[PDB]
Design a protein around this motif. Structure first.
Motif, PDB file in Angstrom:
ATOM      1  N   UNK A  27       0.786  -1.080  -0.011  1.00  0.00           N
ATOM      2  CA  UNK A  27       0.038  -0.066  -0.006  1.00  0.00           C
ATOM      3  C   UNK A  27       0.762   1.426  -0.017  1.00  0.00           C
ATOM      4  N   UNK A  28       0.409   2.128  -0.759  1.00  0.00           N
ATOM      5  CA  UNK A  28       1.060   3.417  -0.572  1.00  0.00           C
ATOM      6  C   UNK A  28      -0.016   4.522  -0.535  1.00  0.00           C
ATOM      7  N   UNK A  29      -0.105   5.312   0.851  1.00  0.00           N
ATOM      8  CA  UNK A  29      -1.235   6.331   0.847  1.00  0.00           C
ATOM      9  C   UNK A  29      -0.364   7.779   0.647  1.00  0.00           C
ATOM     10  N   UNK A  30      -0.905   8.453  -0.666  1.00  0.00           N
ATOM     11  CA  UNK A  30      -0.216   9.492  -1.308  1.00  0.00           C
ATOM     12  C   UNK A  30      -0.702  10.489  -0.528  1.00  0.00           C
ATOM     13  N   UNK A  31       0.299  11.425  -0.325  1.00  0.00           N
ATOM     14  CA  UNK A  31       0.212  12.866   0.307  1.00  0.00           C
ATOM     15  C   UNK A  31      -0.428  13.542  -0.735  1.00  0.00           C
ATOM     16  N   UNK A  32      -1.627  14.332  -0.442  1.00  0.00           N
ATOM     17  CA  UNK A  32      -2.394  15.006  -1.305  1.00  0.00           C
ATOM     18  C   UNK A  32      -1.884  16.122  -2.171  1.00  0.00           C
ATOM     19  N   UNK A  33      -1.035  16.707  -1.360  1.00  0.00           N
ATOM     20  CA  UNK A  33      -0.265  17.979  -2.092  1.00  0.00           C
ATOM     21  C   UNK A  33       0.714  17.535  -3.112  1.00  0.00           C
ATOM     22  N   UNK A  34       1.408  16.200  -2.741  1.00  0.00           N
ATOM     23  CA  UNK A  34       2.220  15.605  -3.943  1.00  0.00           C
ATOM     24  C   UNK A  34       1.137  15.225  -5.079  1.00  0.00           C
ATOM     25  N   UNK A  35       0.057  14.726  -4.847  1.00  0.00           N
ATOM     26  CA  UNK A  35      -0.795  14.375  -6.087  1.00  0.00           C
ATOM     27  C   UNK A  35      -1.099  15.591  -6.889  1.00  0.00           C
ATOM     28  N   UNK A  36      -1.329  16.737  -6.099  1.00  0.00           N
ATOM     29  CA  UNK A  36      -1.539  17.876  -6.866  1.00  0.00           C
ATOM     30  C   UNK A  36      -0.210  18.416  -7.690  1.00  0.00           C
ATOM     31  N   UNK A  37       0.773  18.048  -7.167  1.00  0.00           N
ATOM     32  CA  UNK A  37       2.109  18.589  -7.936  1.00  0.00           C
ATOM     33  C   UNK A  37       2.364  17.667  -9.142  1.00  0.00           C
ATOM     34  N   UNK A  38       1.706  16.526  -9.339  1.00  0.00           N
ATOM     35  CA  UNK A  38       1.544  15.920 -10.381  1.00  0.00           C
ATOM     36  C   UNK A  38       1.409  16.728 -11.962  1.00  0.00           C
ATOM     37  N   UNK A  39       0.458  17.897 -11.587  1.00  0.00           N
ATOM     38  CA  UNK A  39      -0.044  18.397 -12.539  1.00  0.00           C
ATOM     39  C   UNK A  39       0.466  20.110 -12.550  1.00  0.00           C
ATOM     40  N   UNK A  40       1.611  19.987 -11.864  1.00  0.00           N
ATOM     41  CA  UNK A  40       2.187  21.389 -11.795  1.00  0.00           C
ATOM     42  C   UNK A  40       2.924  22.096 -13.262  1.00  0.00           C
ATOM     43  N   UNK A  41       2.889  23.098 -13.227  1.00  0.00           N
ATOM     44  CA  UNK A  41       3.628  23.935 -14.425  1.00  0.00           C
ATOM     45  C   UNK A  41       5.210  23.661 -14.218  1.00  0.00           C
ATOM     46  N   UNK A  42       5.394  23.999 -13.088  1.00  0.00           N
ATOM     47  CA  UNK A  42       6.939  23.607 -12.879  1.00  0.00           C
ATOM     48  C   UNK A  42       7.378  22.318 -12.998  1.00  0.00           C
ATOM     49  N   UNK A  43       8.310  22.134 -13.888  1.00  0.00           N
ATOM     50  CA  UNK A  43       8.712  20.645 -14.148  1.00  0.00           C
ATOM     51  C   UNK A  43       9.440  20.060 -13.110  1.00  0.00           C
ATOM     52  N   UNK A  44       9.986  20.742 -12.037  1.00  0.00           N
ATOM     53  CA  UNK A  44      10.774  20.013 -11.125  1.00  0.00           C
ATOM     54  C   UNK A  44       9.806  19.670  -9.844  1.00  0.00           C
ATOM     55  N   UNK A  45       8.739  20.135  -9.770  1.00  0.00           N
ATOM     56  CA  UNK A  45       7.422  19.976  -8.985  1.00  0.00           C
ATOM     57  C   UNK A  45       6.846  18.614  -9.513  1.00  0.00           C
ATOM     58  N   UNK A  46       6.307  18.463 -10.926  1.00  0.00           N
ATOM     59  CA  UNK A  46       6.028  17.420 -11.273  1.00  0.00           C
ATOM     60  C   UNK A  46       6.815  16.320 -11.471  1.00  0.00           C
ATOM     61  N   UNK A  47       8.250  16.529 -11.693  1.00  0.00           N
ATOM     62  CA  UNK A  47       9.173  15.509 -11.678  1.00  0.00           C
ATOM     63  C   UNK A  47       9.208  14.654 -10.259  1.00  0.00           C
ATOM     64  N   UNK A  48       9.461  15.709  -9.159  1.00  0.00           N
ATOM     65  CA  UNK A  48       9.486  14.981  -7.909  1.00  0.00           C
ATOM     66  C   UNK A  48       8.351  14.288  -7.337  1.00  0.00           C
ATOM     67  N   UNK A  49       7.159  14.755  -7.970  1.00  0.00           N
ATOM     68  CA  UNK A  49       5.730  13.975  -7.660  1.00  0.00           C
ATOM     69  C   UNK A  49       5.757  12.604  -8.444  1.00  0.00           C
ATOM     70  N   UNK A  50       6.274  12.682  -9.389  1.00  0.00           N
ATOM     71  CA  UNK A  50       6.504  11.536 -10.187  1.00  0.00           C
ATOM     72  C   UNK A  50       7.342  10.289  -9.644  1.00  0.00           C
ATOM     73  N   UNK A  51       8.370  10.907  -9.053  1.00  0.00           N
ATOM     74  CA  UNK A  51       9.349  10.162  -8.496  1.00  0.00           C
ATOM     75  C   UNK A  51       8.775   9.517  -7.295  1.00  0.00           C
ATOM     76  N   UNK A  52       8.017  10.434  -6.388  1.00  0.00           N
ATOM     77  CA  UNK A  52       7.433   9.941  -5.103  1.00  0.00           C
ATOM     78  C   UNK A  52       6.154   8.996  -5.318  1.00  0.00           C
ATOM     79  N   UNK A  53       5.381   9.398  -6.411  1.00  0.00           N
ATOM     80  CA  UNK A  53       4.248   8.290  -6.523  1.00  0.00           C
ATOM     81  C   UNK A  53       4.454   7.349  -7.621  1.00  0.00           C
ATOM     82  N   UNK A  54       5.369   7.143  -8.356  1.00  0.00           N
ATOM     83  CA  UNK A  54       5.575   6.352  -9.563  1.00  0.00           C
ATOM     84  C   UNK A  54       6.977   5.960  -9.525  1.00  0.00           C
ATOM     85  N   UNK A  55       7.875   6.333  -8.698  1.00  0.00           N
ATOM     86  CA  UNK A  55       9.557   5.837  -8.774  1.00  0.00           C
ATOM     87  C   UNK A  55       9.331   4.317  -8.741  1.00  0.00           C
TER      88      UNK A  55
END
Length: 170
Positions: A27-55
């Motif tokens: 199980x992984x219970x995603x942090x909701x702010x990190x989920x929001x970051x998946x759709x960030x216009x900032x590339x480094x926010x999105x990338x970190x989000x992808x690492x944290x949720x799909x690494x």
């Protein structure tokens, strides 16, 4: 209504409660702010989000709280135990097209096909529904019944606001 920090408080406490149970490591219970970051216009926010949720070290049954800001919570669940057959479920207690769009952007940004996400009924306070959905499904993963036909159904669930408030108290 519940803020991101409340859902995180609750899911952190839940993860504590489930420690060392059969299948808890799936199980992984995603942090909701990190989920929001998946759709960030900032590339480094999105990338970190992808690492944290799909690494490559992120557990395969992911619970993603979907925040419409000061509007509405819904729950996306991704099961990628089978990389050739990823299943995704969107539970929304509720419709203008925005909530499902957010769930679709999240799916898209996790490398998935959003058209495959099942729109699931739930409890036919939206924060409480999400937390109850997580609680119920997590326990079904633990006891194995998640994989039976009907094992992802939350149609009939009844959030216990008290339990929620008393779990958020502790």
């Amino acid at each position: 209504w519940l803020l991101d920090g409340h859902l995180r408080a609750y899911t952190d406490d839940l993860a504590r409660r489930l420690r060392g149970e059969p299948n808890a490591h799936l199980l992984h219970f995603a942090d909701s702010q990190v989920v929001t970051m998946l759709s960030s216009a900032d590339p480094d926010q999105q990338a970190r989000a992808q690492r944290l949720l799909a690494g490559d070290d992120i557990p395969p049954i992911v619970f993603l709280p979907i925040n419409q800001p000061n509007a509405h919570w819904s729950l996306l669940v991704v099961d990628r135990r089978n990389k050739d057959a990823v299943a995704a479920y969107h539970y929304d207690s509720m419709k203008d097209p925005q909530q499902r769009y957010l769930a679709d952007m999240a799916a898209y940004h996790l490398g998935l096909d959003y058209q495959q996400t099942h729109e699931m009924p739930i409890a036919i306070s939206c924060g409480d529904h999400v937390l109850t959905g997580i609680e119920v499904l997590a326990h079904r993963v633990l006891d194995g019944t998640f994989d039976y036909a009907g094992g992802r159904d939350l149609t009939d669930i009844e959030p216990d606001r008290g339990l929620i408030r008393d779990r958020l108290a502790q």
